[model samples]
Target: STGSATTTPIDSLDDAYITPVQIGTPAQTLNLDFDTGSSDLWVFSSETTASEVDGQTIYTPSKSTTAKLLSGATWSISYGDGSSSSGDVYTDTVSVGGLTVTGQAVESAKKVSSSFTEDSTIDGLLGLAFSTLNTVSPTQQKTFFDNAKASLDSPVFTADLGYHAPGTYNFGFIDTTAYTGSITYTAVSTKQGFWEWTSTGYAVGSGTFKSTSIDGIADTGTTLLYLPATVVSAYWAQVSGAKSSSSVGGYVFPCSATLPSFTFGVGSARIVIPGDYIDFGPISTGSSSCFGGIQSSAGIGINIFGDVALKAAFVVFNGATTPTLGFASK
Candidate 1:
């Protein structure tokens, strides 16, 4: 109980992407992974066969005075990465940062593999992401957000990742002091799993963009900044002596040169990425290079600035107030 309470709660549209309520006794606290890609909360359990429990942390409801299992409910979840797990549904009182929420839906996985089980240090996932793609919608009967939203302080959530350390995923309220300027808001599309939006133009080293403006989507599932290949190549051209070397992964410049700055226009709101974020790393294929955020996704049109680019801006995935996203400085 004396340990530092560093739990960062993420807010997702559905329960699928949030981290589950990690449970460990007062003697042991749990740290879990918060995902935004899928909706479902599960944890390795004591009833799970030993063979299936190899790398997962098993939760024992019997040990917790506040734990309860719902009747006859079973579930399974699959991730785009091809990993999967199955289990039964249970309920429990969970705590995060000394704040406890009652009746938290918890998953007890009966069949788990190393892909997810291996992370013993992580107790489970707290899925605070969006809830649109939730697997339990018509059946399992509830979502974490559906239950917790009423108890939150402000109904506004924010995610902030620290340098080399875990980020803060706050619920109910956002720390306004972390931001510095006026926030920009954009209407949200009634999409399924992704928070989609539009872009007006892109800039390289303060120069005009050549490619047409495009519609973009913000997803927590993806970790890299994905952009149209044509736009990526054009932006690189602005760098002095910057050349597209397929051998180095499409775009590669002497590591010694100053990397150019890039920005994208979201209507009147302009977002700029600094050189540290633009410096490209040569790919092993030697045919292309990978900028920290901008990479070639030729046929894969549309822009996706993963957490790397997104965290730099204070993002508000406002759904209750309206279908819109509010961006500001953090």
Candidate 2:
């Protein structure tokens, strides 16, 4: 049987969406961030040091009869935002929606960075990227989707992220009702353990589309759309009073400026990012300046089509022999 789940944004922090996941026997539920940029199912647990544990609900594996410890197995991961976690491993029954996977490796965090601990509601992260990117040492672990894919009628899942609204993630089957029009498919290159693809070109507002190729990854975990420096500069140049701020470390402009829409090409289909969405609210409350959601991917090698871009369309992560990405207007 197939399964599906809905995720909701956390209060005012639109950085990530979280869904409830069940781990261990007798069912201990935890709010997990389903991250497409990394691979590892990690959670806050009783194993964590008391000082490190703050407002998060800890998973106590000892209470679950089926929990098994993998001696010497450990995992440690750090994100681009400087958040990090490291822990021991435990094999247990894990379930998402209605789909269950037995013997799934669950990393119990023994230590977590301030970013994670400060955001107390998030119990952990569930990685949806390639299993090859799993951080477990001695032996890498398989993600919930990987373990359940073999049993699914079709090895596919869809990510329907929304703007300030709840969205559904469906496993094993596509929900045609969630999207409109036909999906435009693009060949994906997984050599880097990410859903990487190249965009045919891009355009600013109603300008002619430039045929410059852009290499990037479809990363749901990331909050903003990151493009190359040249591309970002071109888009910002059209906006009056926009400037790169040393204090902000990104482009900022007057809040009253009329921003133009940004479009990225996929095959023949164009995904348009609305002008209002580009204005990521004000740089700070009571301030007259606003931060641009689209930024430079200078140090990061690859550009990132984060939530700002993903929320504009319905995406299908097709896991065929040669994986492909399918997109359609939501």
Candidate 3:
């Protein structure tokens, strides 16, 4: 625990949350979230109207000693969660720890929602991942990694930060020493900038649901794991009288019973989801309980492997080469 470990969850805000950086000579702060889902380093600005902004910790460039506003350019991000923010573009010198990069693109959100507006603890999101899913019109929007790749201490960098809370990871470098063993990387598919793969099957407890038939993508942005309705329902059915409870959101089972272990196959990689993750807790839907890991998203297109699954495995996205996603150990 003392020396460097493979994966460490990004500590809560109090420890390493608000990283102070110099934009030119001005000092500014940015919220950092380790995201494998997309690439882009952006922040909320004070110039943005409160009603227009959704998240907390709006960055006021005017007050920053090293902030500079980019003219006539504005941007917005619409995430799969349906939450979005819009704002103008500004160029600033950003620094994290001892690292500093100049001419960094910062998106100042003018509009945000209650969830984003109310919380002032975390300021912004620094996407240290790859730029495959960038929403910028150029399709080649330079992510923080892309801009900082040249100055990185290493050739390949992996983010070992935890997502259970919030924090930042470095850009354009991987500390090979942190891992317990060798790294495992999967080829990135060219379509949609997603790290696509085929799952051999799924299982919970003794119940095995084999379906090597379809492929799934690993996404960190999504909070819940998405699967086919039939498959999800079938898995729930096997859990000794699993019942539907609107109060819990998903299928809820009695807490007294021992939970079964769930596993999925991604090519050669075998991922396991413990039972505790299933019985998330009680929801307002009904007296029954709700399942945590598996959820039914019938209308949502594409099967996404959200944080529930991502935490089980190490992921890397390749933006420097071509659009690609890589998997490794924690």
Counting clashing residue pairs in each candidate, in order, gives: 40, 0, 30
Give me the overall lDDT of model 3. 0.57
Q: Of 1 and 2, which scores higher on TM-score? A: 2
lDDT of each: 0.59, 0.89, 0.57
Identify the superior model by lDDT, candidate 2 or candidate 3. Answer: 2
**Tens digit of per-residue lDDT, candidate 2, span 164-239:** 7778788889889988888999989889999999998899999999988898999988889999999999999999
Highest-scoring model, lDDT: 2
Candidate 1 residues 1-330, lDDT tens each?
A: 111134332332111122334463432244566554455666767877687656555688788776777777777677644677777777776665545566767777787656666544445655545665555523553445545665666555565543233455666666677677777877666465556777667778768764456666665555556778777787777666676656544556655567777777655777666666554354443534433446666655556756545655767666474556677755
Ranking by TM-score: 2, 3, 1
Indicate the worst ten consecutive residues by lDDT in candidate 1.
9-18
Q: What is the C-alpha RMSD of each candidate to the true structure, in Å?
A: 5.8, 1.4, 4.9
Taking the tens digit of each residue's C-alpha lDDT, what string does model 3 give over 64-176?
Answer: 66667667666667666666666677777776655666778777777665555655544556654456665554333566556766666543344443435432344455545
Clashing pairs in 2: none
